[PDB]
Amino acid sequence: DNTEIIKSFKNFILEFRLDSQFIYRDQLRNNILVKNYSLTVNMEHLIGYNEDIYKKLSDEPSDIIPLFETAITQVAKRISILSRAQSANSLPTFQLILNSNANQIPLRDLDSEHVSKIVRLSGIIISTSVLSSRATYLSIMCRNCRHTTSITINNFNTVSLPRSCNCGPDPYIIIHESSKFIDQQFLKLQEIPELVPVGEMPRNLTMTCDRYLTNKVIPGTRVTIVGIYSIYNGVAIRTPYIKILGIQSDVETSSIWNSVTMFTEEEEEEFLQLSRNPKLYEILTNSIAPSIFGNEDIKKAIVCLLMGGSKKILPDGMRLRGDINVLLLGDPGTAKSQLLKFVEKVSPIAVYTSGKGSSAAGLTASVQRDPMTREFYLEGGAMVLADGGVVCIDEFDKMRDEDRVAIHEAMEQQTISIAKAGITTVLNSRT
Amino acid sequence: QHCVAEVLRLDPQSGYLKKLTNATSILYNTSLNKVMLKQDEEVARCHICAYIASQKMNEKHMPDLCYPKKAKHLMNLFRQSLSLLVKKYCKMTTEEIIRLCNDFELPREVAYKIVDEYNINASRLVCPWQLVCGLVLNCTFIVFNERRRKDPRIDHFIVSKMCSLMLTSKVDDVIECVKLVKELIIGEKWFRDLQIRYDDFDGIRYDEIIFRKLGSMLQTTNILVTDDQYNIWKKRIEMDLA
Amino acid sequence: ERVFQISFFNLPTVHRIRDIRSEKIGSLLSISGTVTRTSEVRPELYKASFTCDMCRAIVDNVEQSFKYTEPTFCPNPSCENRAFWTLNVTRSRFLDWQKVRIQENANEIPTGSMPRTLDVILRGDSVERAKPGDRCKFTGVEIVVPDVTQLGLPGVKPSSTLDTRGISKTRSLGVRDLTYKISFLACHVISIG
Amino acid sequence: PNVSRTIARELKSFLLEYTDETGRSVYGARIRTLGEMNSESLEVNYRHLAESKAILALFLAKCPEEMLKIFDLVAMEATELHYPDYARIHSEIHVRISDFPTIYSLRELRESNLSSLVRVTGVVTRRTGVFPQLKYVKFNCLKCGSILGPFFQDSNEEIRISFCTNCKSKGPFRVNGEKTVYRNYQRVTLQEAPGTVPPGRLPRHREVILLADLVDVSKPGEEVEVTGIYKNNYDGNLNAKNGFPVFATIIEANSIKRREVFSWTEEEEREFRKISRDRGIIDKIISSMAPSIYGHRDIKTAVACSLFGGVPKNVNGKHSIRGDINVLLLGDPGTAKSQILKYVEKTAHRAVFATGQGASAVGLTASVRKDPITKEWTLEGGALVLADKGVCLIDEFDKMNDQDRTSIHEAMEQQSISISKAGIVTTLQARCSIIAAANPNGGRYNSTLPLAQNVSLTEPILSRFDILCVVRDLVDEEADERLATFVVDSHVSPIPQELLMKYIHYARTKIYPKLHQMDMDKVSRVYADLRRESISTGSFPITVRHLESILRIAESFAKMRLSEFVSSYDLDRAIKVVVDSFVDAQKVSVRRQLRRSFAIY
Ligand SMILES: Nc1ncnc2c1ncn2[C@@H]1O[C@H](COP(=O)(O)OP(=O)(O)O)[C@@H](O)[C@H]1O
Ligand SMILES: Nc1ncnc2c1ncn2[C@@H]1O[C@H](COP(=O)(O)OP(=O)(O)O)[C@@H](O)[C@H]1O
Ligand SMILES: [Zn+2]
Ligand SMILES: [Zn+2]
Ligand SMILES: [Zn+2]
């Protein structure tokens, strides 16, 4: 039956515990306060607790998932009414989010078998196309009968409108002011370039997501994902893809200028201990380069540099550069390169480049147009990716004149400007 | 091989099976060998092949082998290439009442017993709907006592389903269709076997009803509730903090 | 179990591509030129069976050169619509095919002139005797084939249409546009030069 | 024909009691291995049953697409008899053939041979997709919320149904892609071998379809022998056929091969260790490195240090040290410069032979490149990227523009690439070993000037090269006496390179030899000595770069010997390599250094 399974699943919600503490119960209680209508789940926790759901969810995931959705909705209704009775109408289904670490399978080793099952894999991300919408609950009226009805779609964001509620075929108009919709996006993926055959190009695959599993990723961020090998439409052929059911990403891949700004409280005590120690300067000078010798004078400047300086804005707009500017000058050896190599590790959000700009890395704003619609969009730049951060350079001698002009103006005002044919820009460097 | 066996063992829905699968294989082989037998959707190319396979080996049974336009065409082409109770004096067949009994998903032995009852005692009838309806209802009540006991909602749902299937709004007539058949069919040995099998005996167990009627007070009228009920109910309030 | 081919070689006269007009239609005529391309061997429809769309009646006849669309006669004429038909692949006969592109030769060109070219087709066992980038002496008949590339050109354009005079009460006109190029066929070719 | 009874019984008798030598029932092993490995295919050698009876092949030729029928079900019967419930798991079984003698080119196909057994030759190129297509169908009806039963699909048409079990209604039908079952279907291009196209003629091409779960068993640049059937393709829209009514052709291939996965076995690492720990393998390694040319041993040894790679480390995740080794050769073009690097490509693991403009695999960078198939954006990277663990070859280093030089600069500098184009920002692992070449200005090296003055290269990427070897004209008579004799003989102790590459595969994974600080202050002693002795008589200095590179070479030789840790009397070899590499890289003024710096020999 299905109710035996739904009960064996609902028991896992409130009757599971580890480390002598409830996990999913209070997680749901916190989520309802957050107004999240979703959760997180680990499928490793379900193998030991119960084996009546794993071996059947493996092969019939689409058949078993909506049952779990409805069970979560039931738990939510109970806890909602009880919480309203405790302190202080519309509760739609909750998306289920899960992950795993059992294994990873590459795109190369796939086949036409284990289709519609659940799989694991790795890759790299490219596409962020558009927030294409789907419907979840939309109302209908018949144009002649004026007969109101309703429809709701659940998971496939199978059936079509009713063909007959004389009015004839196609008697229904679609309302929008009283309808409901969700978002999804078409995401791509391609294997690791380092694990490929020598000759051929790589192969990619498409996927889709839903309400709270969207917008989580930006290209370049290596991710491992788990989904279902589903199908839609030679002699007779249907396209393969994957439907997302669980996504895990690195906490923070290539530096994000929108980084964390609210630190924890436990660190503050030792932060202030180090602040009040009179040996702070000596500790920093000793530790900024543990495997390096001499040049204490040079190492005593990096500490001044990293902490920036006095940001001062006057009522005329003529700001003073909050940070400082430095220039090594030396012969081979003398660690003139090793410090620069190391500085990126320590720096929270900063970039490193060589002269003339590195491979496909404009030393400044190298703007171009869109592959789609042929429109203008600022692309990037070594002097703006690290906004609010330090920049490391080597081989400063061999610069192009145009490349050097912009960086030379940045070294004194830290605000590049480009005014080509159509686009006019004032993009802040602050580095 | 999978689909061939799927269709061949669909006939029920010793040597028969083996010889039939061999016959179907070789017949399909002969039909597809030459370029003379084309434009034939495999959607239905294992039906009259099975019919003629039955015809060939030793014995042939006309009924339920053809069970349509192109059926005869393919046969020739291959064989050349080689309310409901007011109505008075209604009629019935095997499969009509088999369908009416199979809408509940009841077993086949009960349906066959009802069919035997009909074909033995359908000579002095006024409306066979009444007798068949009563028979199937009193089969449902006897076989489904467990789920009815654990869920008193079923009673209304089943009665509504069998009131809508016969297109009526009044139900006392259905009540009569039940009690009259109970009166009529009350003393047959196969009915006895069904009674001992599914242990209804008016919806109550034998070992309880004997003491209920013998004149004792130890008879277990279960106004109280079983211990396991309380044991499993405790869990509901165990988690009341949420 | 019998299909034949023929050829006529050692003709006395030679005609360049510019020396071909509209009075040599269906007439044997020797030409010489050059090759710049070949094509893919693709078995061609010599004979092909059909079947009635309401029975197994097979017809092993073929309409071969063109008008390859529809036979009519059915062995059992009792049919609601005997006009159209079905098809079959196995009860059939096939023979080789090949396409090349023929080209002007340098030693016979006029002034202010490009190497005017056209397409010629082969048949039968004589195929495999073509060759890219060589001068050859073809011999065959003035086959012609439909085309539409010649649209947008001046003058009036011929058009076919079935008659509706003498019989009445029976695009409804079924008008088909006709405008043809002058390709060539080859019964036999030799490598000159 | 209805001879299927006799045909089936006789072919099953063959399958069962086949015996060729010593009463060997070969196919029993095939079937039992099939059951053990859960395989979907089995092979049958055409030669033996053809020898036994040939009308088998006659009836196969008349209709092989029909002859398959008894064979697949007989395979199923045999599989079930020895493996119950195999029918439950594997729905159907396909078969394979081998040893067919008839030979057809890709242009020899004639109409008289179609619809019969066909055996061709060619090369697989332009592989595309492993797409799925249906083999069992069930539906989702609208008039009734029910399904359809299972139904096998033909090889040449779609499927569509208008009736229903409940009634004769032609309701809207849709396939339940969420429940059906699929199989493997591929489209593959196939072209003739250019090595035998007769004079003048061009090579024709065809198309091929690969099924039976054998997809992705080929890669471009392979010689293949596909044996199967041949037929036409009625792909609809055929009433618009101008000219003559002629149709295309397509092959359905059964058997596939690749002739016309390196790994180490227990005895193979046993012998590896046995020979590594016995008496200085290095001399024999240099002897067997590349017999392409007799040449000379110094750059062979430099590249030998380049092959194995060192050992990277970090001081608690900071102050990283490069493990891999670099090289840079240079000299007059009259000698062999672009030979041994291609030999290394052929011999190493995950190596690449890239180049600059013209006859190059990739442009030595990463870019948002288009794909011919359905416009597929991809992020390809230079040969450096592919060999993040391995090595990347280059020749004609001088012939680059600004960006394709800054790329290699970034590689050797920070072992990571960066991209800031097309709405995508990323870095990778570029910890590759680099090999390169170049052409001196004027052919001869101009012995009377230093390196940077002589060749117009720049210093910042020139520094990374631990080794900068150079040669010039070898004018003596013995040079002729050896080289001319060897070259003419080309048309008149060393260990197999297979064992060498399996050795390097074995070495890069296990051994990470250490080095104990026993007498290691001699490093500081000799470094200070020579760092003063450089100013004593020379112009340019020697920097701690060479010290670190000598340490890398020491660990590389430790890996080479496969010893547990560094050996004292191999730091001598490393020091000598770096010394005599610096000797030739200076003016004639270094002639004093020849005598002075020979003590450390
Ligand atoms: N002052 C120093 N202290 C410690 N190690 C150094 C120092 N200078 C150079 N090295 C070592 O020498 C190598 C070259 O470093 P560096 O001088 O920064 O680059 P370059 O030699 O190209 O200028 C590095 O591997 C580094 O470990
Ligand atoms: N010692 C040698 N033995 C055999 N062949 C040699 C030898 N030296 C040079 N060659 C031949 O001369 C050619 C030299 O080409 P090379 O100078 O490497 O071209 P590039 O400078 O453009 O790379 C090689 O292809 C090789 O076949
Ligand atoms: Zn209506
Ligand atoms: Zn007819
Ligand atoms: Zn229906």
Side-chain angles (χ1 to χ4, degrees), chain A residues 49 54 214 264 306 332 371 379 384 394 397 409 419:
Chain A
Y49 165 90
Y54 163 98
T214 65
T264 68
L306 298 165
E379 165 53 31
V384 169
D394 208 355
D397 52 353
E409 192 53 23

Side-chain angles (χ1 to χ4, degrees), chain D residues 141 143-144 164-167 169 171 173:
Chain D
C141 308
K143 296 298 198 179
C144 310
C164 184
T165 67
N166 309 277
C167 60
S169 64
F173 275 32

Side-chain angles (χ1 to χ4, degrees), chain A residues 108 111-113 116 125-126 156 158 190 193-194 196 198 200-204 219-220 222 231 234-238 240 254 290-291 332-333 338 341-342 345 352-361 368 371 377 379 385 394-395 397-398 400, chain D residues 40 127 130-134 142 158 178 182-185 187 216 220 315 318-320 350-351 365-366 371-372 376-380 385-386 388 402 406-407 409-410 413-414 418-426 428 458-460 543-545:
Chain A
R108 307 285 293 195
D111 304 290
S112 286
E113 281 184 350
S116 186
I125 295 280
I126 295 91
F156 312 83
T158 293
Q190 63 183 137
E194 287 65 27
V196 303
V198 175
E200 267 186 27
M201 41 205 78
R203 51 202 51 194
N204 70 327
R222 295 180 183 272
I231 296 293
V235 300
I237 190 167
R238 314 283 173 248
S254 56
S291 282
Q338 207 76 28
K341 176 184 288 192
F342 164 88
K345 301 289 215 307
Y352 172 51
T353 79
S354 303
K356 320 163 141 186
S358 84
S359 189
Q368 72 185 249
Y377 81 93
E379 165 53 31
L385 194 157
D394 208 355
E395 275 60 47
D397 52 353
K398 294 160 186 126
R400 285 91 158 281
Chain D
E40 298 172 59
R127 300 184 328 125
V130 305
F131 284 71
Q133 61 90 10
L134 323 182
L142 293 178
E158 302 93 359
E178 316 183 329
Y182 303 70
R183 58 164 64 266
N184 285 299
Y185 168 46
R187 278 208 307 263
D216 284 345
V315 175
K318 50 187 189 299
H319 170 52
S320 78
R350 195 172 292 113
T365 61
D371 290 331
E376 293 179 353
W377 297 118
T378 51
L379 278 75
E380 191 39 58
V385 184
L386 180 63
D388 168 46
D402 302 8
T406 62
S407 69
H409 175 75
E410 213 79 12
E413 183 178 1
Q414 86 181 87
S418 63
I419 298 159
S420 292
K421 214 192 300 294
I424 175 165
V425 308
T426 298
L428 297 175
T458 68
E459 78 267 40
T543 300
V544 61
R545 276 163 31 255

Side-chain angles (χ1 to χ4, degrees), chain D residues 87 100 112 121 146 166 207 223 227 271 273 280 311-312 345 372 406 444 460 543 564:
Chain D
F100 180 56
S112 167
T121 310
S146 55
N166 309 277
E207 190 144 357
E223 287 66 20
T227 59
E271 67 199 27
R273 304 281 221 201
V311 179
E345 175 57 19
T406 62
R444 204 63 52 81
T543 300
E564 61 267 13

